[PDB]
Design a protein around this nucleic acid. Sequence first.
DNA 1: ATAGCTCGATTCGAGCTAA
DNA 2: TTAGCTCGAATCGAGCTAT
Lengths: 335, 335, 228, 108
Amino acid sequence: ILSTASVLAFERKLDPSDALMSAGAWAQRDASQEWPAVTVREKSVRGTISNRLKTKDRDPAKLDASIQSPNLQTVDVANLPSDADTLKVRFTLRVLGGAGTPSACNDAAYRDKLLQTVATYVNDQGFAELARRYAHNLANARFLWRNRVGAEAVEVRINHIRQGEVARAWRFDALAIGLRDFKADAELDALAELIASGLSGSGHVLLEVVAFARIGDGQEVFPSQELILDKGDKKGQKSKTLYSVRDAAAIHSQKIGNALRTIDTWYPDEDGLGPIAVEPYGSVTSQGKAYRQPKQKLDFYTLLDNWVLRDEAPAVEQQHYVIANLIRGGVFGEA
Amino acid sequence: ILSTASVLAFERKLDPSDALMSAGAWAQRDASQEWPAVTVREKSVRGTISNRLKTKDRDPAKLDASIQSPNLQTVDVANLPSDADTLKVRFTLRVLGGAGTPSACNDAAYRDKLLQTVATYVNDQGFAELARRYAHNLANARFLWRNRVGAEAVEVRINHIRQGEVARAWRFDALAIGLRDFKADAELDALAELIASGLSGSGHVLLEVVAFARIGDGQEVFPSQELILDKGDKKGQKSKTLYSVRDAAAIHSQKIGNALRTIDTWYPDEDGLGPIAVEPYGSVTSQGKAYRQPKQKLDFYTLLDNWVLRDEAPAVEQQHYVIANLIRGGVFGEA
Amino acid sequence: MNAIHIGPFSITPAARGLHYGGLPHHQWTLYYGPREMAIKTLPDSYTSSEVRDEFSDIIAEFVIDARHRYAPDVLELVNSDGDAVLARVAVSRLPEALSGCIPDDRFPYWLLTASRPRLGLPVTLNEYTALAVELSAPPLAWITGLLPGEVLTHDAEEWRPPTSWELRHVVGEGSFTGVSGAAAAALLGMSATNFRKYTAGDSAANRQKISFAAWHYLLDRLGVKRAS
Amino acid sequence: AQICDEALQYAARLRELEPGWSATPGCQLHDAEQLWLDPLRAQTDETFLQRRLRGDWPAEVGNRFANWLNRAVSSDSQILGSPEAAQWSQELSKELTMFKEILEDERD
DNA sequence: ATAGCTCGATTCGAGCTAA
DNA sequence: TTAGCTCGAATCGAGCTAT
């Protein structure tokens, strides 16, 4: 009857590293190899009562008493130097290949059927649309999450590191290439073919991606935020902790991977939001909602079950979504 | 059914940088590019008991014995050089735009209704009065909190930066523009138009803000104060530490932002105090009280709920206050 | 001796013994299906009751952790202020109209989740009564978290009959419901021998697989699913 | 009262340790409470810390323990709004002033 | 959707043992 | 209450039909 496998673990393609933040001045970014790193430091914040009150704390005496005892805490803060207006963020990306092959599979017949399904996809249309959209999210600085919202000029440089050396160099204007449209461009097409060769398994590709953002002198930059155990004293609370590896502000690799993953424009709801990350049940953390609900028969699992088990191939857009979710990887199958 | 969302986080507009202190001589402001920075310095203080006693410590023998052992403390102090009477305080400000769009939300219907409300406001009354008041708080050195309370002359310069170069420069006398009146001036009108273009999303607005205050030769300046974990002894208590980034006395960016938000002249109490910082429940730390109590229905939350849900648009002043609260950002929205 | 079966659990002894002190001993290991839970070295002079009492505490803490892990999510009926809880209902699933909500004064009654980011909608007492009637959770709804989703589905084309081990979660005296096999057969209007044929071990020639209607009516009558 | 009695007992049983454990190196060693934790350091330090402990008479240790108890009490706003927190603070003040009077005459 | 059939496999009840 | 077991009888699924 060819039921689905209980264990369907997949390994991820498109492996990014931690993205390190350094700082410097515009028009000296061609010699940015020795730019000083952005350092996460401590500052003190004093806050008032600015949250909603539950109809019992709205008493004027209680509210004023809460004012007389403000919350004192220290926060991890990352800022550019006062003589530097450009933020440099550098990471390396490795594209593996072999997306349809699971890392663990209970059923051999289901494994073979899934391999035939993915091979039929690649033979019909290869990793060309998906790689083009991944190259688009590389060209624009979407991995530069909050450091791009107010940057005046953003430039992304992507190199192909073959034997430890730049075999091919790309330079992009990350603001001309927006965060909404997946258009066509010759350099975008070349990077798309490179990522396609990586995803197909034709050759080994390693991409060094460097983004420069002209934000301003001494302006705040935004690395990834860590978890606080919340055990110390209230005055030295450490309400905000920033991610660094060796005294250098950094962005988590999975955040970079999530920003590169933002290629899903095929979800049933409208195009007002634009692309979203290719996740099962189309989850967006900021909106707190799930596009591609399982009730709407457009999530990853129902589409994969219809495509593989019972040969109901969906539309080519949903096929792109399914293959991008297999590239994304995850612990599929019933636990 | 349009209920308000449980998360309504907003990102801040008008992002200020940390304001660095350097010192020098008046009439050298045009050559103040390489002024020496004001350095936080260590000094030892010894004082007698001066606090109020609780009627049980008023024993003359015990009071005299306490005076026999006065408290010993070390504190951080910031002073000008002896051959320098002018304080230079420099920071940068980014005006972003897109105030009514939340960064995190649950309900899509609430988000759409709130965006429609903000668009209706911007169409009917654009970012003009708010920008005028922000330009006023930028042209009077209110961000020089205790550094202009007794200065002979305060002079602030505003520059507009596109390519690392000044696009247009503003020269202001911060004592002529008082801390009380939001008047009209042609240079102030031009700066307000620039702030309006920044807040409307029309273009990029980056401003460096340099303020010169003639205080006196070797006088004390007042940077931002940090917190002490108090893990030392009772002789070197370290009862006061001051904020600095790299051996240079500095003011916290949130303090500059609080000084820039002091535009709220519409609170129900009498405005003889003057403008206050825009914030929910109008809670000023200096007086320890809350103008715009939720009981008088003039706080940010009740006005926003009535404007968006019930479509009860408040007075134009109150909606100016609400949009200023959207500009400052917040973590609005309880469970 | 011989293996002790307590519902889904099994205490099997080691084949070879040992001597601790001067007395013979065997290692008794506790299982939950294929998951080994604990091993104890016990004297050969213990009876089955003492061996069972040695693992009773581990079984009890497993039961407590299973009740707290798979407890049904709770909906709360609040007033316009959103502070006072007027009624609490535990539901097997949430209403599909739940969105991010803070109660207003436009409606007197609001139904909200007990989760910290609260989801809800304005509700009348009639609508709240209807939702509580058609969404309530049975008192032993936590046992469904210990069972796979392909035995608890109402879709007959996606349904699989439960195994003997999955039956013993709810049918035995050492099970999580605490009813006997004869009581379970009386609930289904079935002979006790025919129902024992359902929970027969693998070392048996007469084994029967329970049907869709019988299994789901058993779950209804046991208070595990579809009982509100 | 039982918590404060156990605190006094715990200091009394730390009194049987080495006389100079408070002088060991360390970034965090609770120097404010080390005056009360090790009375016996005054014997070896005739002029370093004996006169400081005699003249200072550290009673802020009671304040720190009261802050710890405030951290150890349930954060109920209903009690804080009502007079229940007032009675609790009054009885806490009585127990802490008794405890401070216990620590006052430690130099005898 | 109604209405009904055959045929081999599975279930079912009421005896029974076994503990 | 657990844990099974025959033995004939009724039921079950999946093939076909008919109307």
